[PDB]
């Protein structure tokens, strides 16, 4: 049970701090608990046919209350994250997910309505980015260079990524530039014993860390 | 005992390689066509080797070391004995006006640095420092307006006056990125994508 | 005064020298670096990252996500390797795309120890054993379980372990072995054998998957850049 | 002796260098400065002066 | 952390820019017209950029760094193979006699410094020190006789004897004011006034 | 009192001697035949003197000091006044692709070092370090596949564009092995065996 | 500045000089020597070895 403000998720596969750098305050504001909640996005049902799901940050949290109303009513904004994927599955389900935190994730198969979906996330394909190349024109095998983790449904079912603020500028407008990108890809397709539940849910849980906004826009 | 100091960023990247072949020519005294001043916007996205080597990473900070190899040839059997051509090689920094004529003020403007090269001597050479607004170049941009980092432009012409020889010339530009740092490794793009 | 005599090799452009060049903008305050996370010092730091091996390059499975995983069925088990993999990176078609074939395709000489991690993407209930055998260079690819067992092997009990790691040692006469030489085709093999058929309870699916990851070890190294990336 | 090898980028005129040049009149006693009031060191010292804004640029 | 050491007087002004293009020619052996020695009085009031940058201030003390880029061309199809021209570039200090012939004594006089330039070598170069009667140049003078500061003159000719080629030449002069101080800032003149 | 420091390995071996004469030519504008880029694999087994001096020993470690003497001539009575040829002299290290065309990527590739030489200046010069897989060259190998040490290749071409002159050229290559060590002396081969 | 006057015997290739030359591969880790037995320092060390004399050079 976590302690971040109003929201608490029951979490029992250890944290994978991307690039070995913890998100730290710029050396602004200090939202404290204003936005540092655990915004549990909607769950996506992993099935035997699904090919992938791609979210983008902070675009995913563009409607999440205080964070959404702080990144949109400011001008400069920086914040790390603590993306946390959980795939609730029983002992009779087999599979493996790869969670990749793709900085500057340019899924060039690009209108702003196609590359910034938001809470819905997206879906790769075999807008239809190619899963085989991760949507980046590059073989999926190399994708493991990106700070990632593997959720194998016989050793663990949760994966935590601590994403720091990675951007060419020390602080950038959160409404235009998507620093990171979370791509979940089935490495080994789901399979299960007969009559078991045929679609296991996956829940992301983003917790903005060390968020700082500068500027303001009235209203 | 091995070293490992040959897979360093500077060792991997600090290799000169031709990035363009700018064609100019000294107009004939008949003035059939005016000077063909050659203008080329500095961009690494035309050489497969350098681009591919730079797409292993997201952000980079590399200082350029341009160098120019000048060659020329008469287009007619008659020699004409044109006295050694003098080439003006102007580096138009990022944002400055782009020359549009062989007699535009931009050639004479004070801001744009220029090199004067007499055909025959050792190759010209400059070193454009890290010229960028942000704190690191970006080869992949996930944002939208409201990548394509501007390094500047190179405009080359022949200062000499018209002579009835039609002396064509081709300046080869070699770019050696030095003092290069790179962050955020990425998967390498296939060689067919360029 | 102070007379100076120019030498042979002057007025030339050797594209390997570091002679100082004149700054074009000597009155420019360059934007300082801001210490972005994730800096790479040596390209070897990219090799050490455990990328994925495309085991199955079949005409149909290729170009898709089906290439990277090998299916461990529960039917013939005809005492032949599940997968045999050559230990010559940058020359093996199924091992020359894993970020070791992408860094060793820019160099000419390599000298280090690799590291293969096999992960088993099956159910917790599935139980059995596998046999990971390493035939050193100059040997032949073992083609039966007994011969592989007589060599340098590790028994991988998938029931109580999910990933097996094997560090191929660096054995060679020279200090650096040429990357792509078609004469040397005995660089050693790593093979996987069915020690015991898989046992699963109830209706648990028979078909399962195994994934491979190939990474460099901390003592890897390369030499003599090549850069054969043409386009035409 | 002391052999010297010229490098690329020689016999050129880069209009940004500070290589010393030979004085044309090396036997001239230049008139000394007399400390006139109102010296400007940086052009920014001209920006800081509060100038006036032309709010109304109407045609008339 | 920023610098502000790019808006300094020397950084703002110490930029070379062509101030004139002096045309000369080697007379043909037919002696159709004698040598066209080119004489130009050093003045910044012909370049818009330098003049405008200097009119931000009332008084200035700047040392000049003249440099000469020499180019030439045959005017006839026949080469004639004229041996490399030798140009005499004489700096007539302020007040000295102004040459009026291509054979006047002023070329041979001891006082006027001169440079001898063989067409092809690195550009000539001198550095006229602060040459003025007063203690600072004056761009705006409120007095009357009983501005127009005299910096000197530059006279260039071809030492070589007549040859039947009509080798025309155009010396471009680049002036880089160095060690420059400026006093008494003034409003900047519009760009249409020059 | 005598010295004996003239029979030292370096004194005996460190003598420059022509190892090849690579023939190239600037194609005529008629394009009768394309550029004759000259490619030569560095090997000492074509000069009797150096080979024989090296066969006194079994294993050797010698650093090369290649040097290039460039000469050219017009093949036709008409001068054509071709502007000074520019030669690209590329050292293809051991194992790199061997150029097969005068426009192949290998000329523009980043890995292969290259020298640009303007006909007339001081001879080009490089110094290939001890480039070998083993810890010492081997002139006699007693093993079998499953000697002929690879030192690299030298490929030379004319960067200039076609000109109707047919300017043929012959680059003489002089190799001076420096920092040379030798082990395991052997009987000297007769001078008729080569 | 620092003017330099070139002397006679410049722009030449005397095949006996040791003027430094630019390395073609300045980023190469050469294979180190491994101390093979039987190194020769001076060619005289080959003369001192007692070879054999062909006393009878008869045609047969």
Swiss-Prot record, chain A:
Superkingdom assignment: Viruses
Record localization: Virion; Host cytoplasm
Subunit field text: Interacts with capsid protein VP1 and capsid protein VP3 in the mature capsid.
General function of this protein: Forms an icosahedral capsid of pseudo T=3 symmetry with capsid proteins VP1 and VP3. The capsid is 300 Angstroms in diameter, composed of 60 copies of each capsid protein and enclosing the viral positive strand RNA genome.
Record-given protein name: Capsid protein VP2
